[PDB]
Design a protein around this ligand. Structure first.
Ligand code: HEM
Ligand SMILES: CNCc1cncc(-c2cc(C)cc(N)n2)c1
Ligand SMILES: C[C@H](O)[C@H](O)[C@H]1CNc2nc(N)[nH]c(=O)c2N1
Ligand SMILES: [Zn+2]
Length: 411
């Protein structure tokens, strides 16, 4: 009931009691484990006060004023507003606390050592998609900070009825376009081929190339979404060159500096923020391994093996592995030489072990998804591979949510 997690590289053990505060369900049962299932499984007023109370209790606990006068009054105050409105509004302080802890609780995030350094942009006074575009542009410019990337989150108005939803239809604020081809293949990013087509459906004029930044599709107050182009001076990009292979430039690769997830749902005190784009900085492997070498993404192991002079006939020549490493030395070196913040998977996973230590000490645990924390290359030479991790669902949290075009009642 007060479980132990072991590290099998250092023999360090830590005791988790934080999982006791866990509320939501994981997908696993006593007889089945779903730890590798990617996305395992209107809100009313009865359900809403426990969530408000549970959240307010931990917020007031956090400012070292649990159960004080200000707490019990805000408790009463929010209850009265859940009577009056069948919902309620967060204080600016509560919104920042909730957002920061939604990140802190993100068990799939290897970057949470930074969780308390999050810039929260309150966009709950937004009303149109144009306002969203403007808030998002300010977010992009801020979080980029000329390459000295700064983590940030912009929080659009909370869901009310359900048919009035603020949504960023993009899965990330900055993604490259994906166009299928007349010969059945794909240019750009195959992940975004549907979304690239939805933008064309809503009128986007596509410069059908590779690294064509997509336009924002922003839905405000449940209205049909509208297209907006992020001013290209706001989209910082890193040309990928290798520090050894001067044929790397001829590959002609580049990636954007700002990883900014825009399709998830922020839950705070039972309130649901359907549009809450949030950004940090990249870990090299996200670009160099997944974005570039996933079979259904850019799929570049092909050419990088070629220009390196590698035996590609035999599977066991590990030509794939060898070209994969050069690609990630190149992503890293390109970002570093440009002063664009990036972290390598060794430094990032070392910090997460350190972060885990701090969480178990001053918090009693750290929910963690091994399947997602372990980097997608060189897993066992990073320390998180050898670290047992308990996964559980704390709130405030970031949740997945349906793609908007599957759910939206158009017009
Ligand atoms: C500051 C530097 C950060 C680093 C190095 C980092 C690193 C990562 C990485 C590598 C992933 C895996 C993404 C994937 O494999 O698709 C991830 C997931 C995630 N990150 Fe962090 N991140 C950072 C900032 C943030 C911030 C600012 C937030 C929220 C405020 C956040 C919340 C999340 C969430 C919710 C996920 C899992 C959702 C998903 O992508 O499926 N991260 N992070
Ligand atoms: C399913 N996850 C989507 C995704 C794709 N690319 C990048 C990220 C990401 C997001 C953030 C905040 C930081 C980071 N270092 N990376 C998330
Ligand atoms: C099947 C498996 O759950 C799925 O491929 C997961 C594995 N671990 C991952 N880990 C990260 N960081 N990102 C991912 O997209 C995935 N995909
Ligand atoms: Zn399990």
């Amino acid at each position: 009931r007060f479980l132990k997690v072991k590290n099998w590289e250092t023999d360090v053990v830590l005791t988790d009691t934080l999982h006791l505060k866990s509320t939501l369900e994981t997908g696993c049962t006593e007889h089945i484990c779903m730890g590798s299932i990617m996305l395992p499984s209107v809100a009313t007023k009865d359900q809403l006060f426990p969530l408000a109370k549970e959240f307010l209790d931990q917020y007031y606990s956090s400012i070292k004023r649990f159960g004080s006068k200000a707490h019990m009054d805000r408790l009463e105050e929010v209850n009265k507003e859940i009577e009056s409105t069948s919902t309620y509004q967060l204080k600016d302080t509560e919104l920042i606390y909730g957002a920061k802890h939604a990140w802190r609780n993100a068990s799939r995030c290897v970057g949470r050592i930074q969780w308390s350094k999050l810039q929260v942009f309150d966009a709950r006074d937004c009303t149109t998609a144009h306002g969203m575009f403007n808030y998002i542009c300010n977010h992009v410019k801020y979080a980029t900070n000329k390459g000295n990337l700064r983590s940030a989150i912009t929080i659009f108005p909370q869901r009310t009825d359900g048919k009035h939803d603020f949504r960023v239809w993009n899965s990330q604020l900055i993604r490259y376009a994906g166009y299928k081809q007349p010969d059945g293949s794909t240019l750009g990013d195959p992940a975004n081929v549907q979304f690239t087509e939805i933008c064309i459906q809503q009128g986007w004029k596509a410069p059908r190339g590779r690294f064509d930044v997509l336009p924002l599709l922003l839905q405000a107050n449940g209205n049909d979404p509208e297209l907006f182009q992020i001013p290209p001076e706001l989209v910082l990009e890193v040309p990928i060159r290798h520090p050894k292979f001067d044929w790397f430039k001829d590959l002609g690769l580049k990636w954007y500096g700002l990883p900014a997830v825009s399709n998830m749902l922020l839950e705070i005190g039972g309130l649901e923020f359907s549009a809450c784009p949030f950004s940090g900085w990249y870990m090299g492997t996200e670009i160099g391994v997944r974005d570039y070498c996933d079979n259904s993404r850019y799929n570049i192991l092909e050419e990088v093996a070629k220009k390196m002079d590698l035996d590609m006939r035999k599977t066991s020549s590990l030509w794939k592995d060898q070209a994969l490493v050069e690609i990630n030395i190149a992503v890293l070196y390109s970002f570093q030489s440009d002063k664009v913040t990036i972290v390598d998977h060794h430094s990032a996973t070392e910090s997460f072990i350190k972060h885990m230590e701090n969480e178990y000490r001053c918090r009693g645990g750290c929910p963690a998804d091994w399947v997602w924390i372990v980097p997608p290359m060189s897993g066992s030479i990073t320390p998180v591979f050898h670290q047992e991790m308990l996964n559980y669902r704390l709130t405030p949290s970031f949740e997945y949510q349906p793609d908007p075009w599957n759910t939206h009642v158009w017009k």
